[PDB]
Structures are given as structure tokens and as C-alpha cells.
Write a protein that binds this DNA or RNA. Structure first.
Length: 61
DNA sequence: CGACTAATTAGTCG
DNA sequence: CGACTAATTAGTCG
């Protein structure tokens, strides 16, 4: 397996700020966001999956 | 095709 | 240890 990414406080703040406004990203958005943070689109896509899952599990807790 | 999901697996750190 | 969460799996979706 791929080693676990360690997000810097800057990348996490940015992802969290974006998620407040955009829960699902369009492809061009995902590309722009990932490039802005020095990440791959896969790392961004997986962060959004996991963040959506965090919210859903709270909803069903 | 490649988005999504729930479930799972496994690393981080208070 | 345990909440958290990054990465993987095995499906669905029109």
C-alpha cells in the first residue's frame, strides 16, 4: 500500500475551508485545488471521500 | 469508463 | 488504547 500522506496544517486548512462551500468537486475544480496545494488529484479525491464519510457517520451516530 | 458509497485496513498521536 | 483519518476494496451508477 501507498504510504499514508501527512497533510500540513496549511493543506488541511485549505481542504477544510473548501469543503465548507463545496462537498463535491467538479473535475476542473479538483485539478485546480490539488495543484494549488502541491497534491495529486487522487490525494484530493480521497480526502473528499473520507471527509464525506466522516459527516455521514456523524449523521448516523 | 470513472464518479460515488460503505466497509474495511492500518498509521498517527493525544 | 482509541478517535481520527489516509488508503484499499468491492460494489453501484443509467
Amino acid at each position: 500500500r501507498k504510504p499514508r500522506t501527512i497533510y500540513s496544517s496549511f493543506q488541511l486548512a485549505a481542504l477544510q475551508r473548501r469543503f465548507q462551500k463545496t462537498q463535491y468537486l467538479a473535475l476542473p475544480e479538483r485539478a485546480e485545488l490539488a495543484a494549488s496545494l502541491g497534491l495529486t488529484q487522487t490525494q484530493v479525491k480521497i480526502w473528499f471521500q473520507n471527509k464525506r464519510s466522516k459527516i455521514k457517520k456523524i449523521m448516523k451516530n
